[PDB]
């Protein structure tokens, strides 16, 4: 179906400690495949997925050069942003950056992304047309005007429509069996008394890929938003994912609840119930 490539950048100023930190990770779908950390011994882009290790030395050397320059550019961006917001030279601040492409089943660009957050809030983003920018506040409008004059959106559109899709297609061919692969979750319901009158039912989905899943509790056939606790999908640590959904029910009424599970790897949607 649909596939995506994404790069995630974090630059953190630490004026009281010395140099800022720059970290980059790259993902294809939900699979991390590269990383760079300015805080390593000698910083280098490194493989994080088995299908990328076949790239030759020119790949890692070229990309390492890019991250080192990105780290330098970001340090100056952080100094500019500190001026725009009239912020104290004393404290630590964060610039996050997130760009990449989504392609359709035929490999055609569905959407490109290129957006920034400063201190955890939206700052500026390339619009869906890849020709204009949305600025989140007056400070971001300084960047917007500067980047309009620089023709900055045309440079990024060209990467998003050209090389981004082209590298994505190549990664998808290089890592086809797994990058592609669709692994269904193994599922089960647990039951844990909270008190004499209430119990928790927990629906588990374990070991699935990709990370997209729906896990819902239905009481008498109607779903229980407002009362279902739903933890973030969490990594198993082996490139698969886990998720559970919990509902507090009156003891004696457990069997009025069903957990509905839909995942790409499941031949048919699953309806699961507590089984004593």
């Amino acid at each position: 179906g649909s596939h995506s490539m994404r790069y995630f950048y974090t630059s953190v100023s630490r004026p009281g400690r010395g140099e800022p930190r720059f970290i980059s990770v790259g993902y294809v779908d939900d699979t991390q495949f590269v990383r760079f950390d300015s805080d390593a011994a000698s910083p280098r882009e490194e493989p994080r997925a088995p299908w990328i290790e076949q790239e030759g030395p020119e790949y890692w050397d070229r990309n390492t050069q890019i991250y080192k320059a990105q780290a330098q550019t970001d340090r100056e961006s952080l100094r500019n942003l500190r001026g725009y917001y009239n912020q104290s030279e004393a404290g630590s601040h964060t610039l996050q950056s997130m760009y990449g492409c989504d392609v359709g089943p035929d490999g055609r660009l569905l959407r490109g992304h290129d957006q920034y957050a400063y201190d955890g809030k939206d700052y500026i983003a390339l619009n869906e047309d890849l020709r204009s920018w949305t600025a989140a506040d007056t400070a971001a409008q300084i960047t917007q005007r500067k980047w309009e004059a620089a023709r900055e959106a045309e440079q990024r559109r060209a990467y998003l429509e050209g090389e981004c899709v082209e590298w994505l297609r190549r990664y998808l061919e290089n890592g086809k069996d797994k990058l592609e692969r669709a692994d269904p979750p193994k599922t089960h319901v647990t039951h844990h008394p909270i008190s004499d009158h209430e119990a928790t039912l927990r629906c588990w989905a374990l070991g699935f890929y990709p990370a997209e899943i729906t896990l819902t509790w239905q009481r008498d056939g109607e779903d229980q938003t407002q009362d279902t606790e739903l933890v973030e999908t969490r990594p198993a640590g082996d490139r698969t994912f886990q998720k559970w959904a919990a509902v507090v029910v009156p003891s004696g009424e457990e069997q009025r609840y069903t957990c509905h599970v839909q995942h790409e790897g499941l031949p048919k949607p699953l309806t699961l119930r507590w089984e004593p």
């Binding site: 974090t10 991390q32 950390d37 996050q96």
Partner: peptide, 9 residues
Amino acid sequence: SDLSFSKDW
């Protein structure tokens, strides 16, 4: 794991 972030930053 290496530091990353979700769509809400």
